[PDB]
Structure formats: C-alpha cells, structure tokens
Amino acid sequence: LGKTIQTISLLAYLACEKENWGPHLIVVPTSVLLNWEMEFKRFAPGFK
Amino acid sequence: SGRAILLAGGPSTGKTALALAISQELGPKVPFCPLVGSELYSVEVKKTETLMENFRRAIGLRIKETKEVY
Amino acid sequence: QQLKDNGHRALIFTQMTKVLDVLEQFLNYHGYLYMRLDGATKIEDRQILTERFNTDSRITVFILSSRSGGLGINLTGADTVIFYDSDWNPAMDKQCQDRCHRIGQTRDVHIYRFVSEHTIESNILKKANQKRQLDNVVIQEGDFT
Amino acid sequence: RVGRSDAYATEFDLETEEYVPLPKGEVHKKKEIVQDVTLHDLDVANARPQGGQDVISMMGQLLKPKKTE
Amino acid sequence: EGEVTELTPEDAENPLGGYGKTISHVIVGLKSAKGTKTLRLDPTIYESIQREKVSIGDVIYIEANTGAVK
Amino acid sequence: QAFRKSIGIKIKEETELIEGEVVEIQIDRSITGGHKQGKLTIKTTDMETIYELGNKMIDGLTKEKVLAGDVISIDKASGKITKLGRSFARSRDYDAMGADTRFVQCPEGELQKRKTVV
Amino acid sequence: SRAQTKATLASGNFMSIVNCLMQLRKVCNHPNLFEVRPILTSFVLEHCV
Amino acid sequence: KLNILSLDKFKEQEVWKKENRLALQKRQKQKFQPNETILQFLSTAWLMTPAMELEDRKYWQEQLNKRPEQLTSRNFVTLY
Ligand SMILES: Nc1ncnc2c1ncn2[C@@H]1O[C@H](COP(=O)(O)OP(=O)(O)O)[C@@H](O)[C@H]1O
Ligand SMILES: [Mg+2]
Ligand SMILES: [Mg+2]
C-alpha cells in the first residue's frame, strides 16, 4: 500500500512543521535496505 | 525342487491367465519365466542346452555388494 | 513452457537452498534466461539483480529462496509466482504472493502450488483446505494464530 | 569421462566441450547396494568376457560369439 | 597435370600487419607435351604440397576445384 | 526380431544451433608444436559476433576447410560443421574459377538459436 | 517402511517429527537430496571357477 | 539537486555486472608458447573496386611478360 512512502511523508511532516531533521534511526532487513535508500532518494532527496 | 504340474483343459479356458496371475501374485522379486516349446528349438546350440539355461535362469540369487567409487 | 509461450514472467519460491542449486542446473539445461537471489547473494548484487529483473523483462524466471523473498523485494514486474514448496506459514506465503502484487502491477496475477499426489503434502493440503473453508465461512476478519 | 570441469567454462568462447560442475563431497565414496542375479547370469559371466574398455576385452568378447554348450 | 618447374610464393601486404611475411598465392609451373602454363593457386595448396612432398621435377595430379594434389 | 521391428520409439531433443555467414577465420598453429590458437568471426543479418576457438573446434573447422565466403552452421553439442552455401566469389584465384555461382542468402535472426531434433 | 521411522513417529518428540517431515519434503523435492541415484554396474565375482 | 543527480547515476548503475572471470581468461591466454615461430591461416572478405581489378590485371600481364565485384574472399598464410 505504500508504507514506505507514508514513512517518508511522516518524516517530511516532522521536517516542514517541526524542523526536526534530527538523527532518526530505521532498522530494516538487509535486502530491502538499498531499496529503502533508493526510495529516500526518490520521495525526498533532501534527507541525508 | 523340480516340482511340476500340468494345467489341462480346452482352449480359451484360462491357462495363460492362471500363469500370469501366479506371476503377479508371487511378485516381481521371484523369477517367473513363460515359454512356448517352439523357443527351445534353437539353431545355435542343442535343445538340451537351451532347456538347461532356461532352468537355471528361473532360479534367482540376491546378493549384497559394496561399491567403491572415486 | 506454457508460460513462455504466453510470454509470462514467472517466480519460483522454495525453502531449500539445495533445490535452488538443482533449479540452476535445470534452467541451464533448458537454457532459460534466469537470475538468482537468495540468503547468500551479495547485498549490492541483490539490489542490482532486482533492478534488472524489474527493468529487463527478458529474464523469464527469477528464482528466490521463499523466506528471503518474503522480506519485501518489489517484484511487480513479474506476473507469475510458483511455490515449489511450503513451510505452512500462511503469513510467509501471503507475503511472497504479495511481493508480485504491489502497486504498479498491470498483469493479472497467477499463483500455482505444486502438490505431490497422495503424499504427506496431499493430506496436509486437504486438511488445511477444509479448515480454511470452515474458517472463511464462520469468520471473515482476516486474522489467525 | 563425465565431462569438463566448470572452472574452465570461460577458457574459450567456442569449443565442443561439455562443462560439468566439480563433484561434491570427498574423492572416495563407499556404498552398499543389493543386486539381483540368476544362475545363468553367473554362468555367462564365468564363461565369456562381457565388458571392459580395453582392446584385450574387445578381442576376447568378439572371439567365439555364438552360444556354447 | 605436369612435371613441376617453378615454385615461388608471392609476398603480399598483411591486413593485420605485425611485420610478418605473408603470401597470397603459391605459384606453380607445369610442363606437358605441347603445353606449359604457370598457375597462381590458393595458399591452402601449401599444406597439400607439404603432405604430398612434391619436389621440382615430379609429375603431379591437381584437381581444379578440390585443391587436392597427388 | 520381426515383431520388435514393428515397435517405434520417438525421443525428442532440443539442440542449440549456431548459424552464420563467416566474416573471417584465423588459425595460428605452431610449427613443430601442438599448441594451436584461433578465433572466428560469424555474422547474421542483424548481428555480428566473434568467438575464440578451442582445440577441438579448431580441429573440426580445419577438417571442414571453412572459407570466409561460406555460410555454415555450428552445433555446440555435436561439433559438426555443415557448409550450407556460398556468400560471394573466391577472389578469382586461377583455379576453382566459377564453381561457387550458387549463392545463398545470409541467415536472419539470433545467431545462436534453439532447434528440436526427433 | 523403516521401523525406526515408525518408532520415531511413536515417540512424539515434536523435533523428531519435524525432522521426519523435513526428510519427506527433501525426498519429494528431488531424490538426489535423500540418496543419489546409484550408478549401476555389473556384479564382480572374486575369482573365476 | 545533488541527490537527484545521485539518483540519475543510480539508474545507470543498473548496468554494473560482475566480470572478474575475465582475469581467469587473461591468465590462460598468456600460455601460448614463448617466442616460437607462428604459422597463421587467414580467410577474410575483401572489398574490390574496378581500379583494383585493373591493377590486378596489369600485375598479371607484367607477370606473364616476365615469364566491380562487391565482395570477394581472400586467403593468406603468414610465418612470424
Ligand atoms: N476366467 C476368466 N476370467 C476373465 N478373463 C478370462 C478368463 N479366462 C480367459 N479370460 C480371457 O480370455 C483369454 C483366453 O484365456 P487363455 O488363458 O488364453 O485360455 P487358454 O490358455 O486355456 O487357451 C485370456 O487371455 C483372458 O484375457
Ligand atoms: Mg513494507
Ligand atoms: Mg492359452
């Protein structure tokens, strides 16, 4: 359904309104990890 | 050893059927060898040799062997 | 063979690594255009081979180890999924089937399950099916234990 | 000869080689089978040569081809 | 079909270079009663000539389409 | 023997077949030495490829006397080379002048294609 | 058929049954996993008569 | 901007494929015999022009005195 894009959107809401880009942590299986990196690039490339 | 019986009857009466049923009932482990007498009339060796060969071909041996493989 | 005639792209998921190797040998013997990803595939190699399988329709079959494929590889480029075996974890099975079935899928999704006639698998599937039917009739909440 | 080792698959681009993977396990294996034989099979075995990859075996088995008493 | 007289390969430029010595034809001269001709042949003839071990002054048989020599 | 002549068995097999026009062939064999090196270039109407030749492939191609104006098929399993026809003339050497007039069309499609044999 | 298998089943040791199931699945998936198909060859007599 | 560029690069990255086996080729190729003489057989399609045909005819006429085709197949033998 787009859990991952919804995660992006939540973080981005934390970003715009709350300015809190603080060092968030996400722990994930190894295989999807790179796909996660790709989707971070795609949905919100401003995240380090 | 050497027991013999005769299935005596008219044609189309169930002699070959009985033989094949005996072969099936005994199972694939045992050797059952059907023949016609015409097969014995070989041309390379005498009829006795063919008959004796068929006799010892109907006696089975099961052995255990170890195979060494490289 | 039929699927290739139809031009479908099929996934095979299995619990056993050794059968994965056997599948490698089989596919090479037939020479199907196939790729493999499993619990031992290098991570970077995992990323690149999944990108290839999504982009490169030519690869007819992509072989994955069923529980590792469960982990969420996007396989919406595929259209056919075959479970060579089962661990009887229904959640894992649904996860695998859902892999192919996410947003961006555009081909109707066919799943096939191999069952050995009158073997242990046959009895397990019979009982599981009967129970599943009973449940579905009684309960529709979509939860289990 | 079961084939050519897989390690040399890229040794050429175009050859008549058939590549097989390196055998699994240890070099030496030992297993116990059960095989069914008949008395006639033993008689034939003890009478004439029946197999072998040596030219000696070929000559031995192509000699006296017909059945004997 | 002739006795053999001249036997001289003609050097040519190498398409792949490499400073090697290349031939593009092997030349043979043949004598026959009321006949003589000199032929330019497919270099492959060299291998036939090697196998046959033709020497000058030998009488040889050579097939117009086959490239075979005896 | 007569009865068994009347029962037929058909076994179908799938084979991979290479089929091409030859662009050029190269064979570097050492004098008084058993090492031989070679590579083949083989083309189709839509693709061209080069292959580097093994010892057995070199021996077979040398036996077949393949020449660049041949159109030929290569079987990766059996290894036999069949000369299907000619592409153009033999540069007008002074023998075998006009024995290759029967030109054949270049093959079309994938250079290595699978075919079935019964 | 193997009597020890039957005994194992009787034991009811959940682990043992799980292992048995695993062996069954292996057998079904490809026989080479359970026992490589033995390469058949003639019986060898020790010495001729 | 930087990460959009990075994404674009990642798209191209899909080309990446393991090819270390090429080294196993390269080590073997060296095993040709060291500095022996070589015999080569070559056969190759050669383009022809009417000027080249006239030059070849003139060469053949000179050889006798001393005594437009699209594709043609040439053979060569070399020692080196
Ligand atoms: N009692 C029976 N029941 C069923 N089928 C039979 C029976 N007897 C004979 N048949 C069928 O008819 C055929 C003739 O029997 P068969 O054994 O050949 O007779 P016989 O050997 O006495 O000449 C058999 O092959 C079988 O197919
Ligand atoms: Mg998810
Ligand atoms: Mg009868």
Q: Say how far apart CA H64 and CA F92 lie, in whole Å.
A: 17
Within a domain: F1: no
**Residue H50 burial (10 A CB sphere; 0-12, 13-18, 19+):** exposed
Dig out the tokens for F52 from the structure: 């580097």
Within a domain: F48: yes
Measured in residues, chain C has a length of: 145
Within a domain: F37: yes
Within a domain: F70: yes
Indicate the number of domains in chain F: 1
How many Å is the Cα radius of gyration of chain C?
16
Which residues lie closer than 8 Å to E4 by C-beta, 6 or more apart? E28, E29, E30, E54, E55, E56, E57, E58, E59, E60
Within a domain: F3: no
Deposited resolution, Å: 4.4
Ligand index nearest the alpha carbon of residue B9: 1
Q: Say how far apart CA F85 and CA F73 lie, in whole Å.
A: 10
Task: Give Cα D63 distance to the centre of its chain.
Answer: 21
Q: Say how far apart CA E64 and CA F101 lie, in whole Å.
A: 15
| Beta-carbon-side half-sphere exposure of residue A14 (alpha carbons within 13 Å) | 13
Q: How many CB atoms neighbour CB A7 within 10 A?
A: 16
Mode of pairing for the β-strands spanning C61-65 and C10-14 = parallel
Task: Please state the atom number of ligand 1 nearest to the C-alpha of residue B11.
Answer: 23
Within a domain: F4: no
Helices marked H in chain G: 3-11, 14-29, 31-34
Dig out the tokens for H68 from the structure: 């437009």
The answer to whether F117 touches F15, Cβ cutoff 8 Å, is yes
Q: Collapsing DSSP states into helix, strand and coil, what is residue A39?
A: helix
Q: Say how far apart CA G35 and CA G27 lie, in whole Å.
A: 8
Judging contact as 3 or more Cβ pairs under 8 Å, the answer for C and G is yes
Q: DSSP string covering C49-69, please?
A: HHHHHHH-TT--EEEEEHHHH
Residue with token string 């081909």? C107
Phi, psi of E44 (to 5 degrees): -50, -25
The answer to whether C99 touches C74, Cβ cutoff 8 Å, is yes
Smallest CA–CA distance from F94 into chain H, residue:
H60
Query: Helix axis angle, A30-43 relative to C43-55, nearest 10°?
Result: 60
Q: Say how far apart CA E68 and CA E41 lie, in whole Å.
A: 11
Within a domain: F6: no
Q: Say how far apart CA D63 and CA A27 lie, in whole Å.
A: 78
Task: Please state the atom number of ligand 1 nearest to the C-alpha of residue B19.
Answer: 17
Dig out the tokens for D57 from the structure: 């075996």
Q: Collapsing DSSP states into helix, strand and coil, what is residue E24?
A: strand
Q: Collapsing DSSP states into helix, strand and coil, what is residue D53?
A: coil
Taking only residues 31 to 70 of chain B, the set having a beta carbon closer than 8 angstroms to any beta carbon of chain D reads 31, 42, 44-46, 48-49, 53, 56-70
DSSP single-letter state for residue H33: P
CATH number at residue F24: 2.40.50.360
The answer to whether C59 touches C53, Cβ cutoff 8 Å, is yes
The answer to whether H3 touches A41, Cβ cutoff 8 Å, is yes
The answer to whether D46 touches G49, Cβ cutoff 8 Å, is yes
DSSP single-letter state for residue D21: P
Amino acid at F112: Q
Q: Say how far apart CA C95 and CA C99 lie, in whole Å.
A: 6
Amino acid at E45: I
Q: In which domain, by residue range, is F112 found?
A: 12-117
Judging contact as 3 or more Cβ pairs under 8 Å, the answer for G and B is yes
Residue with token string 């482990």? B29
Residue with token string 């270039």? F41
Q: How far is CA C79 from CA C30, C91, C137, E17, E64, in A?
A: 21, 20, 30, 54, 62
Q: Say how far apart CA C59 and CA C8 lie, in whole Å.
A: 10
The answer to whether E18 touches E4, Cβ cutoff 8 Å, is no
Could you tell me the end-to-end alpha-carbon distance of chain E, in angstroms, rounded to an integer?
10
Mode of pairing for the β-strands spanning C110-113 and C80-83 = parallel
Q: Say how far apart CA A23 and CA A35 lie, in whole Å.
A: 20
Closest CA to C73 of A36, A8, H15, A44: A36
Helices marked H in chain E: 45-52
Q: Collapsing DSSP states into helix, strand and coil, what is residue A9?
A: helix
Which residues lie closer than 8 Å to H76 by C-beta, 6 or more apart? E12, E14, E15, E22, E23, E24, E43, H40, H41, H42, H43, H44
**Contact: D11, H21; criterion CB under 8 Å:** no
Helix (H) or strand (E) holding B37: none
Solved with: cryo-EM
Ligand 1 shell residues, CB under 6 Å: B 9, 11-17
Task: Please state the atom number of ligand 1 nearest to the C-alpha of residue B13.
Answer: 22
Amino acid at C51: E
Q: Say how far apart CA E51 and CA E68 lie, in whole Å.
A: 10
The answer to whether C79 touches C108, Cβ cutoff 8 Å, is yes
Within a domain: F5: no
The answer to whether D51 touches G42, Cβ cutoff 8 Å, is yes
Between D and G, how many residue pairs show a Cβ–Cβ distance under 8 A?
A: 13
Query: Does G29 contact chain C (CB < 8 Å)?
Result: yes
Q: DSSP string covering B45-62, please?
A: S-HHHHHHHHHHHTSEEE
CA of B14 to the centre of ligand 3 (A): 7
Query: Does H78 contact chain E (CB < 8 Å)?
Result: yes
Q: How many CB atoms neighbour CB E56 within 10 A?
A: 10
Looking at the DSSP bridge assignments, the partners of residue H79 are E21, H39
Q: Say how far apart CA C100 and CA C80 lie, in whole Å.
A: 8
